[PDB]
Amino acid sequence: LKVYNSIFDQAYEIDPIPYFNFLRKHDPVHYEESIDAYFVSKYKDVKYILKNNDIFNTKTLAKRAEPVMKDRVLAQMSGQEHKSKKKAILKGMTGKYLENLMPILEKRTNDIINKHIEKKEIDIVNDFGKVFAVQSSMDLLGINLENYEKIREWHNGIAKFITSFNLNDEEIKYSLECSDKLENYLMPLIKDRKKSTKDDLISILLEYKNDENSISDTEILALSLNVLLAATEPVDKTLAYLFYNLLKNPEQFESVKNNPKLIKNAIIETLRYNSPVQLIPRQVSKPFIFNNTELQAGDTVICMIGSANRDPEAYSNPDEFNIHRSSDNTSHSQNLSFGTGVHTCVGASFSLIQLEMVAILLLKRLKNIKLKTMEITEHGIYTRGPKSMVISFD
Ligand code: HEM
Ligand SMILES: c1ccc2c3c([nH]c2c1)CNCC3
């Protein structure tokens, strides 16, 4: 082997930060033969890749996502189609749809809190976040909460297919079974929704028109599964990371309590510091070179969002959690936790709003919060988060 530091070394998933530092400095466009892809670790190169959709396109997501999405996902689209359908999805989490949704998500949040408040402790990952995330996503889409437990199971199986690189044949078949079950559950709901429209995102997709042409039913399912997958996975992770980092920095935690407005900045810093979506793949459409590393048409580049967001060329003291960062005082950049360019996260504004509502309610109702999980264990290299994050309260 010419190089000996691999993304797939056991040590990387345990703690990738030393890998970030090594790759940015000594191998910014790093080849991994096991998946025939290059890993891009620097902020400047990640930004360039994401801002140039013509040179680095999203056709990678066709083999990595479509087998379980059952049809085309928003990432695969381009031009006016991508723009119009992205705008249709944003409609479901803005305007009056957002005004109606937020009280519901408040209800979801207080219902979970009410289930745990007498135990004087709660696992932000396993008690709150995993439950809230999938319920919030079902509410956004318009899915009734009766079967949220199975929805979570099937979601986990589909997400594993998207976030994994070396799945065995029994893992693949299970993920596909999960995909079939979710489709078998959702297709009827789309059918009933179109004969009796409501004010949810599934109804938006059914009523969308592009020159009198309606979206096919399987595409509505794929877009619905895209939103379910996309909206669930990062929520539990980011909420856990947020309270963990605050509790591990008590002065910053006290600052958030005194000035509640700082919560938004704490969420943004959390997303930068512990990027829950770690990797964004792209396919190279033509010969290209970064530094002196040559890329050919058809090659795969994988942006390392966490590494970029800790690039010393973009942030001063990048490996320190600091909610008071700002371009008004040092080095500070716009983080890439939501991506950038054409395919930047449609859910970004909603996510920030939803996460602020939950954080404020947790701080309001759980008094004198204390950390019990003194040391987190993180899992995942594509999406990443703590396994557990238990807090205690009065
Ligand atoms: C903390 C929460 C979230 C984070 C960190 C996050 C992160 C990201 C990133 C990094 C991308 C770019 C992917 C790429 O360029 O290939 C993306 C895209 C996307 N996200 Fe999110 N996301 C979050 C929440 C959400 C939510 C709540 C929704 C929907 C309700 C959503 C739906 C989407 C969609 C549809 C895209 C594709 C955008 C496009 O192709 O134009 N995400 N997200
Ligand atoms: C794989 C697993 C999860 C995700 C999410 C996005 N892409 C993914 C790929 C973008 N939206 C946020 C969630």
Is residue 232 packed enough to be buried (19+ CB in 10 Å), middle (13-18) or exposed (0-12)? Answer: buried
343 known member of a binding site: yes
Between CA 5 and CA 22 the distance in angstroms is 9
Domain that holds residue 299: 1-394
Please give the resolution of this entry in Å, rounded to 1 decimal.
2.0
Residue type, 138: M
Is 282 marked as binding a ligand?
A: yes
d(CA 95, CA 201): 12
77 C-beta closer than 6 A to ligand 1: no
Q: What is the token pair recorded at 2?
A: 């010419």
Method in brief: X-ray
Task: Copy the structure tokens of residue 244.
Answer: 């963990």
* Cα diameter, the chain: 62
Query: Are the beta carbons of 126 and 388 closer than 8 angstroms?
Result: yes
The answer to whether the beta carbons of residues 65 and 75 sit under 8 Å apart is: yes
Q: Which of 26, 316, 70 is nearest to 186 (CA)?
A: 70
3-state secondary structure of 215: coil
DSSP string, 184-207: HHHHHHHHHHHHS--SSHHHHHHH
> Residue 8 is inside which H or E element, if any?
none
Exposure on the CB side of residue 354, measured as CA atoms within 13 A: 31
Confirm whether residue 345 is marked as ligand binding.
Answer: yes
Q: How many domains does the chain have?
A: 1
Ligand 2 is surrounded, with C-beta below 6 A, by 159, 162-163, 229-230, 233-234, 277, 345, 382-383
